[PDB]
Amino acid sequence: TDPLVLVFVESLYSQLGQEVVAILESSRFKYRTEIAPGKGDMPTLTDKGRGRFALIIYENILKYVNLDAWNRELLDKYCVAYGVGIIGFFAQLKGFPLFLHCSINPKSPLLYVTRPSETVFQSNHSTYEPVLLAHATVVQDLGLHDGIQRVLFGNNLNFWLHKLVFVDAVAFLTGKRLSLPLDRYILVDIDDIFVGKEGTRMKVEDVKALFDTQNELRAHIPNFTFNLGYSGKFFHTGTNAEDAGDDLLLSYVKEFWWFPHMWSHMQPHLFHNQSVLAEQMALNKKFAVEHGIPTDMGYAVAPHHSGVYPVHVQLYEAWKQVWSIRVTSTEEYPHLKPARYRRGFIHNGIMVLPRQTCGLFTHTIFYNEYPGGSSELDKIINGGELFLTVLLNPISIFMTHLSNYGNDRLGLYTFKHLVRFLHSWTNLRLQTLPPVQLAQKYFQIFSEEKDPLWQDPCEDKRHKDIWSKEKTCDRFPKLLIIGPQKTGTTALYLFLGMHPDLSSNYPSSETFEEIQFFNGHNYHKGIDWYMEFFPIPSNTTSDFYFEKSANYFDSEVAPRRAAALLPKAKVLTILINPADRAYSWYQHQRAHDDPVALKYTFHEVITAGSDASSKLRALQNRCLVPGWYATHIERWLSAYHANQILVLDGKLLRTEPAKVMDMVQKFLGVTNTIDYHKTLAFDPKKGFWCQLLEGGKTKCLGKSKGRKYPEMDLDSRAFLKDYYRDHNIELSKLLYKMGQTLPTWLREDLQNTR
Ligand SMILES: Nc1ncnc2c1ncn2[C@@H]1O[C@H](COP(=O)(O)O)[C@@H](OP(=O)(O)O)[C@H]1O
Ligand SMILES: [Ca+2]
Ligand SMILES: [Ca+2]
């Protein structure tokens, strides 16, 4: 079955359902949230002979017990025939020999992570085995009465142990398909070393406590080493007891790990010149080399995470120039909140990891100086945010600062009690790796996060504050012409730039008006490369910008990338008859001296068998798969709303573009509506519509657009009639669902089918 988790929750805002979804999202468990049927409608469970869900979860198990008989029998038949368990949440239960009304069963088969060292369901039957005892709050049914095992919880996922039991139940009922290895990796980053004016710095007792705590935690976690964020300027600037305490930290230079972390603790996004930023880091490197600090760890952290997300190219280049940084970390990708959504990415040769916080901040000096009270730190340690981060994430980077190792040394005490809690309650093997080894482990576990998902910095206040002030905000287009190719996109592009309120981007060096940002390696070039094609918004200028790229239509990664950077953009896809589109795109390749289009006739290209060249298969894929209009539009329907997408008839644009452009302007909502009837004039020599300049002169497209070639033969037309027949029927249903008018060729093709 598919690894999707079928989630039934009473409403879209219930606390128990959101807690389950939060656990599944933290564990990268794919889920499909649905409204629980109160004798209503059961969604489809099997597709193409195989089930679509490996595990179902029920936040109100009474909606399964009191389920309608036809749906209940369908669900029970599905779960028996595919081995899918039921996680429930909550007199005798109806349909089961179980009555309804904290220790741990040590021999329970649920236990994969939970260590048994430290409403109830009770009756007399052997079809269930209890997991948590009170009689039995959490019971694991053995499937000896119904047929398939189910785990029923007597309470919510509020307690930390119940979350630990829940992820064990997810692992067991799936068959250890939706689970993680017991190996856990932790790296603690101590920030702002040698930062401060008076007080809260290293004394001799603070360094000795830091060294001793690292030694004793090395017995718990093998090779556990602290990472120190030094800062060379605020050296020997504290009290007399703190001048020696800073000097005592250089005696233990071979006992810790160090990362550069700025010369004078200034945000790198304030550095609009790279060379002065590199000279700052060279001063910090000179300090580290002189004091014996190692300069080969390959890891660094910006003082406010300024310039890692959004990308300040000067920070990335200076890190690789002065330090050869390979790993950094941030808490800004994709957003600061919630922390469970934080991912990593690899950009510009630097692997970025999601940095987390242990709850200890810069202002946290004393135990009672911690905000919320000293019990809030103990709550976070003993089954709070600390424990849940280690449990649900394989790799964690925890943030701590200079003040967390001061008078009370809360950084020591917090990680002391956390590791004791982890090894007394879990079977997890805690490890500590160097940040290079830690990052490689992260992108081997999560290989889908190796590509970044760019966003607009000015849509988030936190991202705007750590963005360079020399970069303007709305330098992004509002209209995307996605294609497909050879449908008339250049004529639509050339007639849109004539509008005074609308501005087109600068042409590229090779791809000209096409940027091809969202569908290839140009996405990895960054958003600052993308902003160079669109002029500075200024004030007294046309603030509406558009760009065309015909390869965005059929691309799979382009819609989600375009929706991430430009969620408010308008999508313009134009369609002609796909038999004609395939033929024109075939003849266009012949006109560009493509050697496999010139070697094979159009009938041979479309009748290409599997036992042929890969060049022919690439051309056949290029001719036919973009003609699957229903497939590619549905990809863009997953990313953009229906009202942000307009589907034009390219044959209508071929004949009457003036009414087409009126539909475009009412789609784009312009103010200076151009009368294109007097502005566009049909050119008999060209065969298409062109400009009507002053004096009767006409400005047409080049020879590449609107070519002339012999007509398609009847055999190839007959093949493209039956090939696209189910595609056009799906396209007709799709365009009817969107509320957009069917094209003239589409309605004609349905009439020929009838
Ligand atoms: N005013 C116009 N000028 C040029 N081509 C136009 C046009 N209106 C529609 N077209 C069509 O645009 C197609 C090319 O689409 P694109 O500009 O995206 O490459 C041409 O197919 P052909 O060039 O095979 O005759 C032509 O039929
Ligand atoms: Ca800092
Ligand atoms: Ca800080």
Author numbering: 81 to 170, 180 to 190, 198 to 214, 226 to 241, 263 to 882
Q: What's the publication's text?
A:
Bifunctional N-deacetylase-N-sulfotransferase (NDST) enzymes are the first to act on nascent heparosan after its polymerization, converting GlcNAc sugars to GlcNS, via deacetylated glucosamine (GlcN) intermediates. NDST1 is a Golgi lumen resident type-II transmembrane protein, which contains a single pass N-terminal helix that anchors the catalytic luminal portions of the enzyme to the Golgi membrane. We have carried out a detailed structural and functional characterization of NDST1, the dominant human NDST isoform, revealing a 3-domain architecture consisting of a non-catalytic NTD, in addition to catalytic deacetylase and sulfotransferase domains. A distinctive feature of the NDST1 protein architecture is the opposing orientation of its catalytic deacetylase and sulfotransferase domains, which effectively precludes a simple substrate transfer mechanism for bifunctionality.
To better understand the molecular basis for NDST1 activity, and how it is modulated by nAb binding, we sought to resolve three-dimensional structures of NDST1 and its complexes with nAb7 and nAb13. A cryo-EM volume of NDST1 alone was calculated to a nominal resolution of 2.70 Å (Relion Au-FSC = 0.143), with the resulting map of sufficient quality to model nearly all residues along the protein chain, using the AlphaFold2 model as a starting point for refinement. Disulfide bonds between C586–C601 and C818–C828 were clearly visible in the cryo-EM density, with the former at lower occupancy, possibly due to its surface location being susceptible to reduction by 1 mM DTT, present in the sample buffer. We observed unambiguous density within the sulfotransferase active site corresponding to a molecule of 5’-phosphoadenosine-3’-phosphate (PAP; present in the cryo-EM sample), which binds NDST1 via H-bonds and salt bridges to K614–T618, R782, K833, R835, Y837, R782 and W817, as well as a π-stacking interaction from adenine to F816. The C828–D841 loop at the mouth of the PAP site partially occludes the ligand from solvent, suggesting a role as a stabilizing lid that encloses PAP(S) after its engagement with the sulfotransferase domain. Clear density, distinct from surrounding protein sidechains, was visible at the center of this triad, consistent with Ca2+ coordinated to H389, H393, D320, although a full coordination sphere could not be resolved, possibly due to local disorder within the open catalytic cleft. Further density within the deacetylase active site was tentatively modeled as a second Ca2+, consistent with the presence of multiple divalent ions in the active site of Agd3 and other deacetylases.
